Amino acid sequence: IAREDVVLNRILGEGFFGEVYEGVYTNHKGEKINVAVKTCKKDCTLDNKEKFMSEAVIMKNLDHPHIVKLIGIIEEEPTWIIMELYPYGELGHYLERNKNSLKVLTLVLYSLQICKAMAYLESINCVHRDIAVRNILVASPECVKLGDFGLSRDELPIKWMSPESINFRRFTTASDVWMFAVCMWEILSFGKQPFFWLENKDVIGVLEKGDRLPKPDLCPPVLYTLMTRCWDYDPSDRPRFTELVCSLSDVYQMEKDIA
Numbered sequence: 001i002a003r004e005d006v007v008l009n010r011i012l013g014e015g016f017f018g019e020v021y022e023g024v025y026t027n028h029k030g031e032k033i034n035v036a037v038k039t040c041k042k043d044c045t046l047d048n049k050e051k052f053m054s055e056a057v058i059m060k061n062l063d064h065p066h067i068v069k070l071i072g073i074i075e076e077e078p079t080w081i082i083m084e085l086y087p088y089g090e091l092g093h094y095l096e097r098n099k100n101s102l103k104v105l106t107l108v109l110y111s112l113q114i115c116k117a118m119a120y121l122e123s124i125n126c127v128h129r130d131i132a133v134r135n136i137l138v139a140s141p142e143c144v145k146l147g148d149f150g151l152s153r154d155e156l157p158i159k160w161m162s163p164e165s166i167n168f169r170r171f172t173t174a175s176d177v178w179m180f181a182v183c184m185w186e187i188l189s190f191g192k193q194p195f196f197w198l199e200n201k202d203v204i205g206v207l208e209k210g211d212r213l214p215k216p217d218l219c220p221p222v223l224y225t226l227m228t229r230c231w232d233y234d235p236s237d238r239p240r241f242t243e244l245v246c247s248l249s250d251v252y253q254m255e256k257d258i259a
């Protein structure tokens with residue numbers, strides 16, 4: 001990837017290390033590719049430069065259909081990490097914009113796609129820590145991709161977190177399972193924020209006493225049941241993502257049959 005082939009267009013957001021720009025990359029074939037170009041302040045420590053660059057070193061290895069894609073890296077100053085840009089943007093806002101036209105089958109599809117990504121992470125004992133619809137991008141109506149690009153960060157959102165994460169800052173694959181079911185609640189609620197009726201400080205109290213997020217109107221009952229299993233207080237009683245894939249695939253086929 002040569003710098004002359006990357007054209008920057010507008011600020012996408014601020015990341016931890018520097019601004020992130022929307023851009024266009026023209027590849028060796030000559031096609032134009034929408035990219036998110038991540039930058040790093042020049043005055044950062046060697047450690048922070050290493051951390052910044054480590055994203056590209058890691059992500060080069062990820063090629064899952066439901067994980068975001070690293071396009072490339074320009075190592076020379078100014079050092080740029082070039083991620084694929086998904087013009088549809090975040091799933092939460094996508095759902096908000098499209099509530100009147102989306103079918104439940106499609107909501108279950110997205111849940112299963114993310115579950116498959118997470119089962120892959122579980123297979124290598126990696127944890128996400130920030131599973132939420134803001135970290136999922138829509139590649140197309142038929143395809144979502146999981147990212148990890150929130151300003152906290154290879155491995156707080158209180159209203160998404162397991163009780164052990166809230167109480168002890170403990171984060172395991174089992175706590176990701178809890179967070180993933182919250183993400184599913186967001187999907188099935190067309191982007192509503194979980195516990196929007198509470199302040200962060202009230203959340204643990206509610207969980208300790210046995211209260212949970214109510215079933216979204218459109219959520220199939222069997223899917224709500226799975227959600228509630230992911231919200232078992234005891235991390236040992238939550239399913240593994242690997243087995244959840246099987247459970248979700250069953251819900252998808254039940255939903256596809258009735259459609």
Ligand SMILES: Cc1ccc(-n2[nH]c(C(C)(C)C)c/c2=N\C(=O)Nc2cc(COc3cccnc3)n[nH]2)cc1
Nearest residue numbers: 036054055058068083084085086089146147148149154
């Ligand atoms: C050091 C380090 C840092 C991050 C990671 N991980 N880990 C993961 C897992 C595999 C999911 C866990 C993803 C990841 N990186 C990213 O998601 N990067 C990314 C995405 C974006 C936003 O892109 C957009 C936004 C809007 C529209 N279009 C595109 N910015 N940066 C790994 C190592």
